[model samples]
Target chain A: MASMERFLSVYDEVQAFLLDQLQSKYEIDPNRARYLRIMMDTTCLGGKYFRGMTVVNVAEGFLAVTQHDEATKERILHDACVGGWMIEFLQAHYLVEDDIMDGSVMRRGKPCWYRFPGVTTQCAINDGIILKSWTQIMAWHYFADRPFLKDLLCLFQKVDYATAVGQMYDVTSMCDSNKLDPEVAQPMTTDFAEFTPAIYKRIVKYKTTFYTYLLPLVMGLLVSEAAASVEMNLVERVAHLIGEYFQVQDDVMDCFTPPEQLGKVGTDIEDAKCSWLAVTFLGKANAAQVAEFKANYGEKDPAKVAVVKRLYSKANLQADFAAYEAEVVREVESLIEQLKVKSPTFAESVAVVWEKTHKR
Target chain B: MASMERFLSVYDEVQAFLLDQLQSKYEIDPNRARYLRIMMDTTCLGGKYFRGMTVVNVAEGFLAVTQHDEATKERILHDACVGGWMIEFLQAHYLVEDDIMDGSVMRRGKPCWYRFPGVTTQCAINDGIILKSWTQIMAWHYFADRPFLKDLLCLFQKVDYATAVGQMYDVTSMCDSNKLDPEVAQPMTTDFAEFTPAIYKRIVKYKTTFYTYLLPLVMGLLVSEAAASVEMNLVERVAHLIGEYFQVQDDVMDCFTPPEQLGKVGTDIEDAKCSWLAVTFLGKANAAQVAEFKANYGEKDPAKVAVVKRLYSKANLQADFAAYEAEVVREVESLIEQLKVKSPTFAESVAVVWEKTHKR
Candidate 1:
């Protein structure tokens, strides 16, 4: 417990340092400065810092083999954590643009950088482009000569390419409804229903899973020359399941959380967004329920907010979501058991994920 | 005549090849294929191939000393021409997004990609991203270990950054005006006239001159191990002046060309666009002309279009434009004469820009 606390402090210090650097290096003017701050606050704060923390976590996990002094271990941990912060920066780069493309107003309970005052819609798009560029520049300067350097770059390219394609699909999927026009609306599944949830899972997995969960941890492990056996795969799978659940909870909070608590309004509802909850609701709803939803839900309606809420409750979608959440937790617990065959450091890493998964 | 013919044929062939590659790589699906084609066509075609030819032109200029064998010269020329194609691709990338951001309906006598059937505002944006990515990917592969590797990369980045910044300023300037109330419409001045020309010049100099003329040609000349000294600065300055005129002519054609000739009504008059021609008119217009322009100009006024045309005729703005055009030509010619002292090859290059300036 004491060792973990020491590493966390190191991670915190690196995170603060990266934010300071990003502001100094990239934020050229007031407009960019404001966006950078908003982006850091929205994307860096809240939720799991698993991928980011994995940088230090995996490094420390490997270093457990040696009997190093606490002071030396702390420095190594700090180095690994800085790498982790880079992964978070990568996430921010893509999200800032993704938010603009999807016309999102709030992200992680704050106004998205795109929607901030003085940023034209066009700048929002450019900000996103600059965000992606920063990742490449940062990697080039920071880890250019690292042993797994080429492999990491190839992996980064593949991951970013996949995310771009997934984002493309998400944007195009909305317009598919035009084909079904004039036909009766129908619910084709139960909980986690429809193609939307499946696509959502794929998108989240592509955009967040590899970059956020596996890559950072794997990099730290690789850089430290630690052996990553089948247990690493198990960790990835479990972490991915947990990440999905985490995102679903996030989606739910965006809609249902109080404005004061969340720091932003429920904009997804207004945007006719394809959120996890909506997909699950669609799956749980019958044909009649689906029709009712179309009438009252899906974009701006001054009068039908209550009607839509009642229909969602009646369809038992919330209960279905609860079940999905429980399944993920069970899966994570099962995976944790499997990690015992690995080093104690690995086990500790799993424990970190477990503890953070249920944070209030 | 034979040499010029060969160059023109090569330029056309290269553009055709680029278009084919773009459509095949980016189309991905039947749904997106048409939109991708429209984007490819708009951004690629119709420009004089001064930049493309310069790659070869500069290469040959350098090789005149060593007088390389025909096959070696051809190879160098071909390599140089690729730089011009890179410029075209870069321009395409930005314009794809610019069209969408500004809600442009047509470009280059055809429908804008965003305005194409089944093309949402979204795909247009995607094309822009793809265009940018494609250029970087191409540059990385094409110039992998060339002697001037770092310089080539820096040149591309410099060009992209400048163009992006200009675009940002251009868009912001428009937004600021749109935000103002009609009652707050500022008095038109010769200064206002100068502002549009200034901004327009910035756009063309950065957008066209660097990538399209100077960078490709200078990089080509330098890569061939030539003393590209005196030739370089003169080329950039003359090329910029010529491009400024090219853009000014573009604006004039946009306004004066009949719908059948131009393929679409100009967007400038409707938006009261801050173009060189409009700026000149604003500088030259009397109170009556200004009042008439204010009433009918920008977007929805057939009467306003005619009224603005009449005002132009009365003020002889067309004649004034011609005088400015002649002045630019004279300055460029004088610069080219000075450049001949450095190398006749430099003089020939400026002559190419001079030729294109008067082509329309």
Candidate 2:
């Protein structure tokens, strides 16, 4: 209970700091400030906060191992929490935009922010930019005097730029189904044959992995003195492996997990998402099974969804996923063991993320 | 003529630099980059570039009088142009967003960026952010090594933040008219009774004067060695008075200018803008005339537009506006004379902007 309280205090402090900034520095009017406050709370808070937690945890672990003086640890801990909020701020930016682009209606068991009454897509667009601006503004406020400001800003710039491109790929893939425009060619489709494992890997690596796994872990590393001691490539290599597995887990759960367990209906099949299960099923299916899959996929009809599920059952995808999961777990566990020699704090942080995904 | 050529070359160089950054540094995909390229060209170019030109002209004027050496002159000129392009980039961000928010159909005699096929409100939102990101990225590349980097970032941050709030007020005013959200209480209305001249002045100062007039002028001052030599409040006060006049002219022109002359149909009335004319007539009209104004204002019917024009003509608002314009010009001219005693370059730059508004 005490440990959990300590962990959550970081979130609380960061939240208060941001709200104060919104009122003071941003100088938002009371009427509109109400809405901006609601936006910040809805989009930035209420998550599991695993990304935010990793930032604090890694910094704490590093400080403890390095045996830094109390003053240094206290300052670094405060800076680490700011970095944690940076993660939350960036996550909010991605989610707000992704919801609008993906046309998803429910997020975290409520109407998406854009779908809220009085909030048009125009407001959503501005709100997303506003969320992103906080990260940049906060970075300057907290980290500008540090030697790592340039590194931090560059990392953020690169990550945000990449995520936007990844989003373009995702939106463009689904955009063709809506036929929003004829001039721009969308490169992917609901047709399972068109989506290969390599393409799925690219989408996940750029969109999910970089922001989700690498950002928090690397941000924590960057804030601490350990940043200078670690090899970024090796750290990235390890994080990407874990991140790939993490997204594959998400794809598998989207299909097999019940809506109640997931807190929202899984629309991957109906939404024509380029999901892992669909690609894996296509890789192994016979001609008759392929026809069966094609007929029922990318439709919202429950019966059609059932038909696709029957194909998954016949193909024994659950067992295949289990085998794949075991192999990935072994590789990540092995990587952690090796990495611990160089940076135990980073290795442990990666393990915590791996364990969360594994349990989920 | 040679000086004019030199002035124009800066625009070309900055344009090429931005396109190059989009392709190389940002690594935007070829397909979407094409649309982003179009957006840049359409919004940033085709303007008289009074805002951007002020950045270069003010810096050049200051540098010439200060008598910097040839190498220093060339370097500062190039930097001033970069500062100029920063103004252009920020302008692009505002125009792309304002058009979408205002539902404007055409700009610069071409379809608004959002009106392009396949470019929905979502693309406009992202494109706006991309343009803003260029300002930040370019600042680091050009001004990061300078002593005034923090000063520049803070100035840009405050200006952009203020602009967004100005936009919020403008949007919230119209938003209530649409009755989109029931929870938030909106204070203003299309009825001229609710909009005081003070309120109109607030909107223009926050939205127009800051970004359009004061920002470019101040940015040039900040980048040069003269940044520490002058008082900013005096600069802002002078610019604000000019900016207020500039927007009143825009409001006046909207009602009075020919469509052929303006290159677009005036929709301020139909869009329910808190325009200067509406407030002015309300200030002067009797109760029955107020009713007549209320009925015809904020509607698109041509006959109704004629009725509003009849009210303006009856009130002799053109003469009123003429008097107002002369007063503003006299004040600006006197301020420039006084400012020239302190900084001739600053005064001349203000004169250039004042003259543009005067002619337009």
Candidate 3:
């Protein structure tokens, strides 16, 4: 409940703070400054704020136990907003570049920044970098006085590398969808040769789990100064489970949910993405099913796409996904109990994140 | 004399250390691991190592007085190399992406990484990002024990942002050379409307000077623990002067020097780059020179290119540039005296860098 409260509370403040910094602090050109501001607003806004909201909620939850003066409480809010928005900035950076790499057209109801008028792939590349640069600048600006700040910076670097690795796996595992240059833009690894249980788990863990779930949880804890009070190993364990569970849910929803409900059309099949369904179908598929899957997998034609969809529907993979979700929730709850041994607020806050992302 | 020694000293070690960590520590796919290794070698290798070398040299300059034992000295070397190489990684990241954005076919005697076999604009983007991530990862890995590590991280962020702003200014200032997508990829600013001295200085400072000059000197001071020992304002003033002087020399070289001598064909005219000559010629031009420049500038035709070349030659822009350099050298030499007030080695070191870049 407080997640949305804190989420909306600082949403505008973060954007305003960044714009204020860009305009006043950085002695840059008016046109270029405006370009950065426009890029940030277009890419960083209109998201669910789901991940950022969790960061602040988790932060607020941890700090609730301490009896702070009003001034301290306001500072905490300011600091938490910075933490939450920095993660969103990271997300925006990834999305902007991912849109270019994936050859995406629209995002968050706007043309991908790369595709927008007056901004092509070149400007978008640097803009994505500028967005990523802000994460460190803001971290340094807000948290310079905090102890263990290196730890936070390390986490940011680690998660970014992990996501890059995940992105490499995701792209290399599939047929190149857009193939911009056509000659050299060909996929290095295609035909789903690298799609296996081991590879899939690593992809899910590195690409989605760490940034979306783990960073937010850890960021909140770090900002609230409650990280030292908890068993970090337990936090990692629980977030990993939740992240895996959440990613699979996302993949399944991509296939089964309606576009309006899912909020975007799914292209995993057309892109031949190495998703849960891809690996799971490969695992239990018959010889003919495998042939059908490969025949129609990466085709752009709607008829071919729908044929693959029919195959997925016939396989009853959603039922298996539901079973997996149930198992993960059970596992995550067990780890939450483990977490409750030290920081009860942390454990509770994490459990709420589980419920919020839970599809079942 | 000692600069190149320390420059080349840890040159290979940094690459080896990162590769060792990646292969042994991170449980990544073999193919992706090899991809990263290949990208780093292709982009990071073959550079002059001038910037990285200066970082270590300045560090050595400050640390030469410390009567440290063998272990302490070895550790200082290790820390200094980390500082130096991280800057190089930052450099590598920028070049890989810049080559892509600039539509360059070749770099370092091979095809640009984006143009290499099986790696297109898409993979190159992520590869550049991974290289950048290593800078922070290595910094955290090596410098966590240092007291002012946050300051180092902030510098990395600042320089990266500075370069991005510079790059944004640069590409925006030029006619869209490649225009991969003809409809939306047209440049927002062109026609030399932004080629004023003020804009040119901002471009030089943000794009080249900050990363090439400012980062190396400041990074060395920070790593050597000498940042607090000097007048920081003086260092900034000196570096700013050196950076501007160095930039115009580069621009002059780009326009006037031959491919065999300068090692690359001058394309500032062909690309409609907002170079020093463009601004300078525009600054003091007769009606015919101005008309001929506007007509022949940014032309892809060799005949038209020769026309702009003739205008530059007839105007004696090179002589004017030389005169400007003589003035700057006089000014810079005076500031070196000020820098010598605190650390003699530091002052002498700054003087050496001036001579290395001076063409007048």
Candidate 4:
């Protein structure tokens, strides 16, 4: 806890470095500099920094115990801090594009980057491209000569690829027609048969879990010790479970939390999103309740939204969510408990994430 | 010339490997598999394979002169072909996202991927992500152990970053008002005053030259002969000249060439793109001609389009374009000539590109 302030300072350094890089490269062109500046302020600066901090925090937690000489230790610490920002850079890439695809208007209590005056979808797409390129470039510059450089690059690429796959599933699930499913030809049905918990778990694992939960932890291990592939794979499995819990909590918060608390209005209901509440409630609803859901789901009207909310109440979804949360926490705790015996910092890192996210 | 058929076979092998990789990874999800298949067919398989072929052609054209044993030669040749397909993979990533951003309907004589039935802009963005990830993965697989692996990765990243910046400039330039520009308060004027030739050249060098022209040439040199970075930088300057010429030719062909020959209707004028024609015509027009040009420049109306065409004719842009083409060719040739004695195959590669693109 004595080093917590240093974590914040290091995080600030990461932000400054990212901005300085963009400014120096683009300042010659006034127009490009303007757009780059807006992107830096809007997308990269406003995040909670939980993902990025986790990379540094976990690395510090592990690196403190390592027996490296001061010089080698200093280099690894510096590189690991850069890797911390790399995670944020990667998240910025995902968020800018995700905000556009989700048609989100506000992020972190301000207009999304694409929603800013004079910025179009075209520039938003390009903004995403720039962020992604920077992430790879930073990785190359900081970790190119390391033994785990390939591992780090491969991890970034794989997580991004998996997120893309998850996004594909998430988008298709929301389509009015599930054309790819051979057995299902109906349009706009809320039977919950198509959007099952299995699909929801898969989407969560790929889209949110890998990048948000696993990447930071894995990156920490990669730079800290000579971690075997087997050990990394085990961390991935444990992290995936924690990630699933993290996403379910997000799905819960979207509907259950207030706008002031969440920083933006939740559109999962109106957007016909494949949310956990939707899947959980639909599974328990009777035929009459199901009819109500079918009538009210995916409609933009406030009255329909209210009806859907009432339907969730009728199915006792809040109570069910609590039960699900408890089960997930228990599973994650047991996994972390086993790993903590060998690596106490594994649990400490997981505990930090829980403290940050477990509450509203 | 003796290995021409072998070049064809190697190109085929590149396509097969790319498809196989995508197919195996995405086969579990039928929807993703379906989209991946369409992307492979529509994007990866559509282009003339010029960029990809140039990588192999330049590599082969250089490899033939090297004194390698049969085994070593075959191995190096295989790696270069993989590098060639990496270019196409990178292109596919850009094209899928670009087509969406530009609202293009047809790409390579078929509907854009985003326009496919049941697909949304969300899926199109995800498709781009998949293509990009595969590009990195293939690079790691083929070139990870090479001495110039860092150079290759950094090259891909830098080119992509530059393209992103160019796209940002190009998109912002088309806005009805440059609100982001602190000094400029004008609105919706195609005065061509804002879109200068310098800006147009910047766009060409970044969006076209680095990725389309220079990357293939430089990649061949990196893996073939032990090229000096100074020599690489020189090739970049020459390639930029050639790429500027190529894009200017494309700009000219878009308006002047027949749609039958070009395989698609030209919308550069209607799209309010920053083109050489727009800047050149603006630079020389009288007040009346300027007024007429401004009125018709960015409009989609057939009458307006006709008026713009007439204005171009009156300005004698056709002759000017011919002169511009000759000047660019002479300059690029001179630069290539200086380097040709040291690397004759480099000049041969440049000649191949010029032959394919120099004519109407």
Which prediction has the highest DockQ against the true structure? 4
- Please name the candidate that would achieve the greatest TM-score relative to the true structure: 3
Clash count (model 4, backbone only): 0
lDDT of 4 by residue, A225-284 (tens): 546422555577778887887888888788878988888999888888889988898778
In candidate 4 chain A, where is summed lDDT lowest over 10 consecutive residues?
A177-186
Q: Return the TM-score for candidate 2, rounded to 2 decimals.
A: 0.87
Each candidate's TM vs. the true structure? 0.68, 0.87, 0.92, 0.91
Tens digits of lDDT, candidate 1, B45-64: 66655565666666666777
The C-alpha stretches of model 1 lying farther than 4 A from their native spots are: A1-100, A103-160, A174-198, A207-243, A258-275, A278-360, B1-86, B141-150, B173-200, B215-235, B278-311, B318-323, B330-350
Using lDDT as the measure, the top candidate is: 3
Model 2, residue B97: displacement in angstroms? 2.8
Off by over 4 Å in 4: A1-27, A68-75, A144-147, A175-178, A181-186, A189-191, A226-230, B1-27, B174-186, B189-191, B225-230
| lDDT per residue (tens digit) for residues A1-360 in model 2 | 233455568656655666676668544545566677777778887888888778788887787678777888777877777787887888898888778756777877777887876676657766776777777677887786887777777677667766765665555444433443424534334355447777677677777777788888888888885776567876777777888888888887788888777767788877777788888898888989988887888789999998888888789887878888888888888888877778777788878888887787
Which residue pairs clash within candidate 3?
none
Interface RMSD of each: 8.5, 5.1, 6.6, 4.8
- Per-residue lDDT, model 3, residue B330, is 87
User: What is the per-residue lDDT of model 4 for residues B110-199, given as tens digits with 9 covering 90 to 100?
Assistant: 677777765567667877887878777778777768887878878878888777776766766665334564233324554565678887
The superposed Cα distance between candidate 3 and the true structure at residue B296, in angstroms, equals: 3.2
Q: Per-prediction TM-score, chain A only?
A: 0.76, 0.91, 0.90, 0.89
Candidate 4 displacement at residue B335 in angstroms: 2.1
The superposed Cα distance between candidate 1 and the true structure at residue B318, in angstroms, equals 5.0
lDDT of 1 by residue, A136-223 (tens): 5545555555665445555555455545555555554444432321122322222222347666786566545666566775667655
lDDT (0 to 1) per candidate: 0.61, 0.74, 0.78, 0.74
